[PDB]
């Protein structure tokens, strides 16, 4: 019978640890998030990824193993109260985690940096994205480290809108001679629900309507 404060802290910590575990397991599957619905009857986890087929396994064999591991780690006392479900991301051109994982996977095969960056740029922008930015930092060719930036369109930096309308991720790739950092930023096509949830637009516009004639 612990107090409310400790209950909420416990939920936060469990959320974080589960997310980190799943992000490690499903690296090569475009992992993008987790949702947990804790009932005292059963707890249901809902994974979001791009490649649902190879997440599921052969007749769902892999997802059964994932369920067993998650249960033995977090719900040790009981026996069968947890189940998992996989879902596919509707528009993968606006999920920053997916793009960052794709760039990492490309760069691990030895492909040139510039081609991969222009490719991901062209892929994000054709999904309607209003702006985008990709940054790669480290020993690129020489022994002295460097950064490279690649931009397109329109992007915001300050204020409260920049936290609503922008999607961000960071990843790293272990090359033979060091580590490279990957940093992706996507501004969503004027699509952001509000804190008092409703589809908003932009805190910077004053269109004036045309009189009826």
């Amino acid at each position: 019978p612990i107090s409310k404060k400790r209950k909420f802290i416990n939920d936060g910590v469990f959320q974080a640890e589960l997310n980190e575990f799943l992000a490690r397991i499903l690296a090569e599957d475009g992992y993008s998030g987790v949702e947990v619905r804790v009932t005292p009857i059963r707890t249901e986890v809902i994974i979001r990824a791009t490649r649902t087929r190879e997440v599921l396994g052969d007749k769902g064999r892999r997802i059964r193993e994932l369920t067993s591991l998650v249960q033995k780690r977090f719900f040790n006392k009981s026996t069968n109260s947890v189940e998992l479900f996989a879902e596919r991301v509707e528009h993968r051109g606006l999920c920053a985690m997916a793009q960052a994982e794709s760039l990492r996977y490309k760069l691990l095969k030895g492909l040139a940096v510039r081609r991969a960056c222009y490719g991901v740029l062209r892929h994000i922008m054709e999904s309607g994205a209003k702006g985008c930015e990709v940054i790669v930092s480290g020993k690129l060719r020489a022994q002295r480290a460097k950064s490279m930036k690649f931009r397109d369109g329109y992007l915001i930096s300050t204020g409260e809108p920049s936290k609503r309308f922008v999607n961000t991720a960071t990843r790293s790739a272990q090359l033979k001679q060091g580590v490279l950092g990957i940093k992706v930023k996507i501004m969503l096509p004027t699509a952001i629900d509000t804190r008092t949830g409703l589809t908003s637009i932009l805190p910077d516009n004053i269109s004036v309507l045309e009189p009826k004639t």
């Binding site: 490690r24 059964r64 193993e65 591991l69 780690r73």
Partner: protein, 98 residues
């Protein structure tokens, strides 16, 4: 009970760990050698750590580590080796495969 040295795994402890791994499919191990016993298994934690370390070197499990835990998973060769070791009929399968 002649009180051997700690970390001198008897045959029974290894048999119990193999039985659990075969029946269940997977195992979580909690890397800490100072714990007295495993949640599902009445054996010193160090013994489970040592056995699972030994299986990975021979490519019978795959493991990967999230902060403070191990998360082992059995191969197909693991299944075959455990049938040969434990003498089970060629019909039995671990619970994950159903």
């Amino acid at each position: 009970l002649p009180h051997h040295k700690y970390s001198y795994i008897p045959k029974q402890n290894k048999k119990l760990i193999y039985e659990y791994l075969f029946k269940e499919g997977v195992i979580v191990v909690e890397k800490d050698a100072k714990i007295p016993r495993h949640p599902h298994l009445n054996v010193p934690n160090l013994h489970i750590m040592m056995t699972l370390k030994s299986l990975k070197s021979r490519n019978y499990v795959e493991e990967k580590y999230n902060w403070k835990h191990q998360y082992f998973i059995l191969n197909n060769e693991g299944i075959e080796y455990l049938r040969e070791f434990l003498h089970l009929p060629p019909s039995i399968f671990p619970a994950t495969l159903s």
